[PDB]
Design a protein around this ligand. Structure first.
Ligand SMILES: *SC[C@H](NC(=O)CC[C@H](N)C(=O)O)C(=O)NCC(=O)O
Length: 209
């Protein structure tokens, strides 16, 4: 009979959902790691890296230092889905950002938050059955939401290319409108980035395996 609810099954769908998000996150990671390993001398034409200095330093985010290579890697994590040959156009647009140091900082932060999450979870992708079912669900939701945040930001940056292309809202022919459009875009991205930190901490706090 007689209209039943089942736990072991609810758990299995969450586990399978998790092993799939983790696998797909990991491919994303292998792709941005490769994007750094195979970085051209001109860094895909992202010339903005050469104008972003570490806090009390002449060293740029372009330089050949571990911290500078990670910065660029975490940036590539955020720019990962955009075709590598459009990055120079994206860069040329962002040069006109009033906040490019902050904007590139959120790129990096997003990529790093993501990388920290998949780095934590990847090795545990068969130990997740150890979790209480309820924070398995919280884990699954937080991680799915975190991947989603990163996608939305890559979509927004890809959309900026097309809107510039098409002069959406005069951004291509009126520099003042581009600037305030880039400013709004920074606010939005910064927000996703804060949200991403939260989610990452959620994930870490309840998956101490
Ligand atoms: S992405 C992680 C760390 N830095 C940043 O995200 C801030 C970048 C700037 N605020 C900016 O360009 O706007 C990072 O690189 N950590 C490594 C370290 O050595 O601290």
């Amino acid at each position: 009979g007689a209209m039943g609810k089942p736990n072991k099954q609810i758990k299995n769908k969450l586990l399978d959902d998790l092993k799939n998000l983790i696998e797909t996150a990991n491919e994303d990671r292998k792709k941005y790691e490769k994007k750094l390993e195979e970085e051209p001398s001109n860094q895909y034409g992202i010339s903005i890296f050469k104008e972003i200095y570490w806090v009390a330093s002449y060293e740029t985010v372009a330089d050949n230092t571990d911290r500078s290579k990670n910065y660029r890697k975490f940036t590539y994590a955020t720019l990962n889905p955009i075709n590598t040959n459009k990055l120079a156009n994206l860069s040329k647009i962002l040069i006109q950002s009033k906040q490019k140091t902050l904007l590139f900082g959120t790129f990096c932060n997003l990529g790093r938050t993501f990388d920290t999450a998949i780095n934590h979870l990847y090795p545990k992708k068969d130990a997740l059955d150890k979790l209480e079912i309820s924070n398995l669900e919280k884990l699954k939701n937080s991680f799915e939401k975190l991947l989603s945040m990163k996608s939305i930001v890559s979509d927004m940056l890809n959309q900026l290319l097309l809107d510039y292309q098409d002069d959406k809202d005069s951004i291509k022919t009126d520099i003042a409108k581009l600037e305030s459009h880039l400013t709004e875009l920074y606010k939005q991205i910064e927000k996703k980035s804060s949200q991403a930190t939260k989610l990452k901490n959620n994930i870490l706090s309840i998956s101490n395996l």
